Scaffold this active site. Structure first.
Site, PDB file in Angstrom:
ATOM      1  N   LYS A 127      35.115  58.562  44.325  1.00 44.47           N
ATOM      2  CA  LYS A 127      34.274  58.420  43.147  1.00 44.47           C
ATOM      3  C   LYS A 127      35.012  57.916  41.917  1.00 44.47           C
ATOM      4  O   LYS A 127      34.493  57.070  41.190  1.00 44.47           O
ATOM      5  CB  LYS A 127      33.563  59.743  42.847  1.00 44.47           C
ATOM      6  CG  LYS A 127      32.214  59.863  43.544  1.00 44.47           C
ATOM      7  CD  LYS A 127      31.623  61.261  43.419  1.00 44.47           C
ATOM      8  CE  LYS A 127      30.241  61.347  44.066  1.00 44.47           C
ATOM      9  NZ  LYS A 127      30.278  61.234  45.558  1.00 44.47           N
ATOM     10  N   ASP A 133      35.082  57.362  52.341  1.00 44.64           N
ATOM     11  CA  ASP A 133      36.411  57.933  52.482  1.00 44.64           C
ATOM     12  C   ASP A 133      36.984  57.798  53.893  1.00 44.64           C
ATOM     13  O   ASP A 133      36.513  58.446  54.829  1.00 44.64           O
ATOM     14  CB  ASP A 133      36.365  59.403  52.079  1.00 44.64           C
ATOM     15  CG  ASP A 133      37.737  59.975  51.821  1.00 44.64           C
ATOM     16  OD1 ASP A 133      38.736  59.337  52.214  1.00 44.64           O
ATOM     17  OD2 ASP A 133      37.813  61.068  51.227  1.00 44.64           O
ATOM     18  N   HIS A 147      28.043  63.919  57.445  1.00 42.79           N
ATOM     19  CA  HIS A 147      27.014  62.915  57.684  1.00 42.79           C
ATOM     20  C   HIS A 147      27.598  61.557  58.079  1.00 42.79           C
ATOM     21  O   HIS A 147      27.100  60.497  57.676  1.00 42.79           O
ATOM     22  CB  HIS A 147      26.118  62.776  56.444  1.00 42.79           C
ATOM     23  CG  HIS A 147      26.864  62.453  55.187  1.00 42.79           C
ATOM     24  ND1 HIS A 147      27.791  63.309  54.627  1.00 42.79           N
ATOM     25  CD2 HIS A 147      26.819  61.367  54.377  1.00 42.79           C
ATOM     26  CE1 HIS A 147      28.283  62.764  53.529  1.00 42.79           C
ATOM     27  NE2 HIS A 147      27.710  61.587  53.354  1.00 42.79           N
ATOM     28  N   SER A 195      21.101  62.511  47.359  1.00 39.17           N
ATOM     29  CA  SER A 195      22.514  62.619  47.668  1.00 39.17           C
ATOM     30  C   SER A 195      22.677  62.040  49.073  1.00 39.17           C
ATOM     31  O   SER A 195      21.751  62.096  49.883  1.00 39.17           O
ATOM     32  CB  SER A 195      22.923  64.094  47.670  1.00 39.17           C
ATOM     33  OG  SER A 195      24.329  64.239  47.651  1.00 39.17           O
ATOM     34  N   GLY A 196      23.843  61.479  49.365  1.00 40.56           N
ATOM     35  CA  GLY A 196      24.067  60.911  50.683  1.00 40.56           C
ATOM     36  C   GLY A 196      23.752  61.868  51.819  1.00 40.56           C
ATOM     37  O   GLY A 196      22.975  61.538  52.713  1.00 40.56           O
ATOM     38  N   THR A 242      23.293  56.498  45.294  1.00 40.47           N
ATOM     39  CA  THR A 242      22.923  57.750  45.923  1.00 40.47           C
ATOM     40  C   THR A 242      22.989  58.770  44.792  1.00 40.47           C
ATOM     41  O   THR A 242      23.612  58.520  43.760  1.00 40.47           O
ATOM     42  CB  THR A 242      23.900  58.125  47.046  1.00 40.47           C
ATOM     43  OG1 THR A 242      25.208  57.651  46.714  1.00 40.47           O
ATOM     44  CG2 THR A 242      23.470  57.479  48.357  1.00 40.47           C
ATOM     45  N   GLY A 243      22.343  59.910  44.990  1.00 41.84           N
ATOM     46  CA  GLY A 243      22.287  60.943  43.973  1.00 41.84           C
ATOM     47  C   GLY A 243      23.453  61.250  43.051  1.00 41.84           C
ATOM     48  O   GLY A 243      23.385  60.997  41.849  1.00 41.84           O
ATOM     49  N   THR A 244      24.519  61.823  43.585  1.00 45.93           N
ATOM     50  CA  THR A 244      25.645  62.179  42.742  1.00 45.93           C
ATOM     51  C   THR A 244      26.332  60.971  42.130  1.00 45.93           C
ATOM     52  O   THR A 244      26.606  60.952  40.938  1.00 45.93           O
ATOM     53  CB  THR A 244      26.660  62.998  43.519  1.00 45.93           C
ATOM     54  OG1 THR A 244      25.965  63.852  44.437  1.00 45.93           O
ATOM     55  CG2 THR A 244      27.479  63.842  42.575  1.00 45.93           C
ATOM     56  N   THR A 245      26.612  59.961  42.944  1.00 44.51           N
ATOM     57  CA  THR A 245      27.260  58.760  42.436  1.00 44.51           C
ATOM     58  C   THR A 245      26.447  58.174  41.280  1.00 44.51           C
ATOM     59  O   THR A 245      26.978  57.952  40.190  1.00 44.51           O
ATOM     60  CB  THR A 245      27.394  57.698  43.532  1.00 44.51           C
ATOM     61  OG1 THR A 245      28.268  58.181  44.563  1.00 44.51           O
ATOM     62  CG2 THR A 245      27.964  56.415  42.957  1.00 44.51           C
ATOM     63  N   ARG A 286      26.041  49.710  59.487  1.00 47.56           N
ATOM     64  CA  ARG A 286      25.531  48.909  60.590  1.00 47.56           C
ATOM     65  C   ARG A 286      24.361  48.043  60.136  1.00 47.56           C
ATOM     66  O   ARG A 286      24.258  46.874  60.515  1.00 47.56           O
ATOM     67  CB  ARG A 286      25.086  49.802  61.754  1.00 47.56           C
ATOM     68  CG  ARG A 286      24.786  49.012  63.025  1.00 47.56           C
ATOM     69  CD  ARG A 286      24.030  49.833  64.058  1.00 47.56           C
ATOM     70  NE  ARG A 286      22.701  50.197  63.584  1.00 47.56           N
ATOM     71  CZ  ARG A 286      21.612  49.453  63.749  1.00 47.56           C
ATOM     72  NH1 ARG A 286      21.683  48.287  64.383  1.00 47.56           N
ATOM     73  NH2 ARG A 286      20.445  49.879  63.278  1.00 47.56           N
ATOM     74  N   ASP A 310      25.221  58.916  59.360  1.00 55.54           N
ATOM     75  CA  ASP A 310      24.452  58.246  58.300  1.00 55.54           C
ATOM     76  C   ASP A 310      25.290  57.119  57.694  1.00 55.54           C
ATOM     77  O   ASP A 310      24.789  56.027  57.417  1.00 55.54           O
ATOM     78  CB  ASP A 310      24.093  59.228  57.183  1.00 55.54           C
ATOM     79  CG  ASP A 310      23.279  60.400  57.672  1.00 55.54           C
ATOM     80  OD1 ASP A 310      23.677  61.036  58.664  1.00 55.54           O
ATOM     81  OD2 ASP A 310      22.240  60.687  57.054  1.00 55.54           O
ATOM     82  N   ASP A 363      21.714  58.020  51.983  1.00 50.75           N
ATOM     83  CA  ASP A 363      22.228  56.848  52.690  1.00 50.75           C
ATOM     84  C   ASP A 363      21.139  56.144  53.478  1.00 50.75           C
ATOM     85  O   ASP A 363      21.123  54.922  53.572  1.00 50.75           O
ATOM     86  CB  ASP A 363      23.363  57.241  53.635  1.00 50.75           C
ATOM     87  CG  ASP A 363      24.630  57.626  52.894  1.00 50.75           C
ATOM     88  OD1 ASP A 363      25.501  58.242  53.534  1.00 50.75           O
ATOM     89  OD2 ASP A 363      24.759  57.317  51.685  1.00 50.75           O
ATOM     90  N   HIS A 417      32.093  58.223  48.310  1.00 51.78           N
ATOM     91  CA  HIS A 417      32.317  59.579  48.775  1.00 51.78           C
ATOM     92  C   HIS A 417      33.138  60.251  47.695  1.00 51.78           C
ATOM     93  O   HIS A 417      33.807  59.582  46.911  1.00 51.78           O
ATOM     94  CB  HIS A 417      33.046  59.577  50.115  1.00 51.78           C
ATOM     95  CG  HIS A 417      32.144  59.266  51.265  1.00 51.78           C
ATOM     96  ND1 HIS A 417      32.602  58.759  52.460  1.00 51.78           N
ATOM     97  CD2 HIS A 417      30.800  59.363  51.386  1.00 51.78           C
ATOM     98  CE1 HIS A 417      31.576  58.554  53.269  1.00 51.78           C
ATOM     99  NE2 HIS A 417      30.471  58.913  52.641  1.00 51.78           N
TER     100      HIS A 417
END
Lengths: 152, 152, 151, 152, 151, 152
Positions: free
Chosen positions: E23, E91, E98, E65-66, E45-48, E107, E101, E71, E19
C-alpha cells in the site's frame, strides 16, 4: 460416466469439521441443533470432535487433527460410503497450510454426491430439510463399471 | 512441536501409486524388483494395484482409484502408521483434476516422515538401501502432545 | 515421450534446501553425515547454505534466498543437469508465500528423474544407499527429440 | 524491507515467452516491432525462441522449453538481474501442467520490479514508452541487507 | 478464437488495488503522478480506495475490500469493458487467504487484453506511454461469436 | 469479525452454474423442479443460462460465460447481496483453466453465508427445505464495522 444409486440411512453418519476461526460458529450450531444431532452418528476431525463432545457431552468419533491427516481420513470414509453428510466450516479468510487436504475433501464430497455445508446458512437449510431424517436415494458414480473400463 | 519415534517393521507396508502416463514406468520397476517386493506387503490405488497384480501375480491390496478417493485412503493409512513406504510416480507433465488429493498425499507423507519416491531414480535408491529390510526408527510428530496443546 | 540416459557422477552435486522450521532438522542431518557429504559438491539456497557453512565449515555454493529466486536457480541447475541430488526439507505445516516456486522445483526434480528427499527418513535411505558414491545411469527425457517434435 | 536501486540499460535484455495458444499473437507482435526489438538483446524459452528466430531471422538466446525448466531459467536470470523486461503471453483459457512454474516466474518478476507484459495491450504500452530505450532506474529489494537480517 | 476491437477512451477508467504491504508503494506512486491521475476516472478496492482519497483528496470510486469481494467486483467491471487499466500491486512475499480471487482478477485482465501493472516499474512505463491520454483500440475476444459457438 | 443480519426474500435470487460435464445433470435437476423454480428469479453464467432457457422456456438472466468473467460477475452479485442461493455444479473430475475463478466464487459464497449446492444431493436438500420458499434472516459479516477498523 455411469451412475448407480446408494441409500442414505435415516440415521445419518455426519462428519463435523471446522477451522479454528470457525469453531465457535460450529459449536453454537451444534448446541443449537443438539436434540436432533443426538439421533445421528457423529464423526469429526481431532480438535473439533474433542471440543464438541467436551462441551455437549455428545458422543463423537474423533479422527486425527485435520493438518495431521484427519481430512483425508474423513475423505476416505466418504469415498467408502461411510459418511452421509459433511459439515465443513472451512475458513475463507485465512490461509491454511493444509489447503490441498481441504480442497481434496470438498472435491470428494462433490464426486460422491453427499449433502455438504460449508457455512451456517447451508447447514441450517440441510438439517431443516424434511428428509434429513428419512432414507434417501442419491445417485453416485458406478465405480465397478468405471474401474472395469480402466482395465478393459 | 514435540517429536517421538516409531519403528518401521522389517517387513514394510508399501503403497504403489502411478498416474496413467507413468504406469508403464512403475510396472517395469515393480517387475525388475519383484523378488524383493514379494517379501513385503503391497498396497495400491485402484487401477495401479489391479494392473500390477494382473501382470506380476503378486498380491496387492487395491484401494479405490485415485480420482475416486484412493489417494486419500492411502493418505489416511499413512497418518495411521499403516504405510511405511510410498512409491508415487505422479505425472509432472500433465494436469490432473484431482491435483489437490495428489498434493495432500505428498504433504502427509512428508509430515509423517516416511520414505517417499516420486521417480524411478529415488525409488531405486530407497529399495537398494540397507535398512529397507530392517526395522528402522524414524522420528514422527508426537500427536498426543500436539493434540493436548490444541485442547489446552 | 522420447527418453535417453545421463550418468550421475560418483561425486554428486547436491542441493540442500530447507524452510525455516525445518532448518534445525537439516542442520542435524548434515552434521550427522558430514564426513560423507564432504566428499561431494554442495549447493544450497541463500539462508540454508550460509547457516550450514557457518556451522560446519563445509564449503557450500549458496544461491539466492528461496523467496528471492533461490528455488528457481536450483530448478534451473537441475534442468541443466548440474544438480544430481535434491534434499529439500519443505515445511508441510506452514504456508509459504513462494509456494509456487516450491512446487515448481519439486516438479522439475521429478521430471528430470534425480534422487529427491523431502524428509529425514528419505534422506537417510538415499545417502545410505550403496550406490550413492557410485556413478548411476538414469532415464531422463530426450529433450532434443522433444523440441524437434514441437517444431 | 530496505530498498536499493538498479539501472536498466538503454539496450534491454528482453525475455519472450508464450504459451502455445498465444504464440501466433506474440509472433505478430514481434514482427510488427522487429525494427525496435532488433536493437535489444532477446531471450526466450525453447519453442518460442526457436519459432521467433526461424521466422524473423532475429538472434534469440533460447533456453529450455517452459515445461522442461525454461521458465525457471528465465526466473533465475531475472533474480540475477540479467533480464530487464519480461513479455510473457501465458494462456488464461487453458490449464497448463507447469502452472506452478508459470506463477513462480510472474511472482519473481513482480518481486524484482521489472516491466512485465502478459497481454498485447500491455506490451504495446511498454514498448512505446519513451524510456524503453534509455537507462531507467528501478527500485529493487536490497538483498544484502535482507540476507544479513536472516542470518542475525 | 475470432477477435474484435474495443476503444480505450482518452479518459481512462483506472482500477487501483494494493495488498497491505504494498500500500505504501502504491500511495507514493499515486502521489508522484497525481497531476496526471487527476485527469482520469479512479476505481479501487475498499481499503486501498479510501486510503488514497483520504491522503490525496482525489475522488476514488471504492468497491468492497479485496477479501470481501472487491477483487471480483473489479474483475466483473473489466469483463464488462468498464475498466481500461489495472494497477494491482499484489504481495509476492506473503500468502493471502483470497489468493484465488487475486489470480482470477489477473487472469481476466489478461483475457480482456487491458494494460496491467503489478509493480512500480511496469506502472511507470505504462503511465508514461503516449497513448495513455489518448483514445486507442485494443483487440479483445469476440464474445458474441464465442457464445454462439458454445450453443 | 462483527456480525450483522440480512434477510433472504421469499422469492429468491438463484444463480445456476454448471461446468460442461455437469450441465446435463443440472438440466435434469432444473426440469424436474421447474414448477418451483419458475417462482423465483434465475441468474446463470452464459452457456448454462442459455441452455436452460432454451430447454425450459424459463426466464434466465444470463451473464458472461464462466471463463470470460461470468463467475466473477456472479461473485460480485453475491457480495452485493443480490444473489441468495448458488447452485454451482462444478466438475470434480476435470481440470478447468479458470479454476481460480471457481474457487474464488465458492470462497465468496462461504464468506457471505448464502445457501450453496455443489452437487445434486445438496441441491435437493436445499430446495426441499422449508425456508427456500419463505423469507428468512441470516447472519452476514458486518462490512461497515470491518472497513472502519481497516481505516483506523
Amino acid at each position: 460416466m455411469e451412475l448407480t444409486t446408494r441409500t442414505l440411512p435415516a440415521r445419518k453418519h455426519i462428519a463435523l469439521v471446522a477451522h479454528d476461526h470457525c469453531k465457535q460458529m460450529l459449536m453454537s450450531w451444534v448446541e443449537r441443533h443438539q436434540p436432533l444431532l443426538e439421533q445421528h452418528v457423529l464423526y469429526a476431525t481431532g480438535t473439533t470432535g474433542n471440543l464438541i463432545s467436551r462441551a455437549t457431552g455428545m458422543n463423537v468419533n474423533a479422527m486425527l487433527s485435520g493438518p495431521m491427516g484427519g481430512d483425508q481420513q474423513v475423505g476416505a470414509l466418504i469415498s467408502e460410503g461411510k459418511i452421509d453428510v459433511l459439515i465443513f466450516f472451512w475458513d475463507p479468510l485465512n490461509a491454511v497450510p493444509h489447503d490441498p487436504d481441504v480442497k481434496a475433501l470438498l472435491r470428494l464430497a462433490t464426486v460422491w454426491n453427499i449433502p455438504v455445508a460449508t457455512n451456517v446458512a447451508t447447514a441450517d437449510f440441510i438439517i431443516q430439510s424434511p428428509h434429513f431424517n428419512d432414507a434417501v436415494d442419491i445417485l453416485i458414480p458406478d465405480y465397478q463399471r468405471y474401474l472395469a473400463d480402466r482395465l478393459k
